């Protein structure tokens, strides 16, 4: 069915400093987007306060790049509740860096999404297969297992609050730029699974963002793929050209 | 022989609300002490900007509860460089909870430590054995190995920026504090190993802090031990009680 509202998400990973982010916030604030788009910026936890105080572009929400499910005895971590008290209502969960370096299993990701959902958060749930998994011809088994692991914790009505980001981790970890066709190939199969398990309604309204290598140069040809509803952008989202990335979802 | 400057460090862990921390910080600002003590407060990353904005008590420094080096996965994480640029120059590293839930090995803690030191941080390096380790007669072996891993990535002139916190895992959030003697016995072990590697001057100057169910009701009896130089306080750090604990380092 016809495309739902696009999302342009920035993952500011753990870069930025007041020095870098201020001029970058100013640029996004000066930009006007005439179309229906939800922009999302995910600053590091430390930078979320200056981002919230400074960010004014009306299409934008501020996200967290991660979170744990409960407050209490967890040194170094930030909970969903603490984020929500602060007025943060978006969070990225399941990012490939978290799955791979930080021991976030399908179950761990799934449990965080279930809780963020019940805490009233919109969630960008990340999914993606490694080079080793792709080459074993296990792309579909892996992304659909990550996806079904999350769906098992949720009900029909959760999905108005869920967004999926496809991370082509096979391309990221091999220094490749996936093609619009490679991206679309996996977005299509994620959507086909959603359609069959949750409904055509759920499937039509679901945003599936592409979390590969996104530049002002490729943004528009990625967005013209049938099942791409936007982006989770890495490096380019810390640059003025993020404005042109947003524009490409028009 | 005589004890170096004590430290009273608050670990806020995964707790907070702006609603809670404003009055707390106001109290801390009004607290006045008659002896030389380094106070440290370690908010969540999300709460570090509010604390830096509001804390004026000049006996106090702000610490992060954790950080990564330049060579970690950044998503969800906050780097040593990012903190420094924020003006934060204290960091708690190797906390039990992170060694236990977030897979930080002895090597990883060591890297973070060495890196934090190179960047100008004062580092509170945490160590401590679990109940099962203690039961198997492994306390020394465990804590000296955790310590030794750190020590080997450092040089003699690093030690002026290092602080050990001994937290027996069995004393974290259990109401079971190490009797003065159980703690003394371990602080002694640690200092004595420091002395074998680094000599008289280093060993004498190093602060070893006790962590694990510190309250206003037990802190003074602990601080009386010869090898205890203050505290890393968890639940009680988020109460007016923490002032009384600082006073107990007199």
Author numbering:
A (entry chain B), B (entry chain A): 2 to 251
Extract from the study:
Triosephosphate isomerase (TIM) is a ubiquitous enzyme that catalyzes the interconversion between glyceraldehyde 3-phosphate and dihydroxyacetone phosphate. TIM belongs to the family of α-β barrels proteins, in which 8 central β strands are surrounded by 8 α helices; the strands and helices are joined by loops. A peculiarity of TIM is that only in its dimeric form the enzyme exhibits high catalytic rates, albeit each monomer has its own catalytic residues. DTDA is a powerful inhibitor of the activity of TIM from T. cruzi.
On the other hand we were able to obtain crystals of the complex by soaking crystals of TcTIM with 1 mM DTDA. Accordingly, and in regard to the inhibition of activity of TcTIM by DTDA, it is relevant that the enzyme soaked with DTDA exhibited significant and rather unique alterations in its dimer interface. One of the most notable was that although loop3 of monomer B exhibited a conformation almost identical to that in native TcTIM, loop3 of monomer A acquired a markedly different conformation. In the DTDA treated enzyme, these H-bonds are missing.
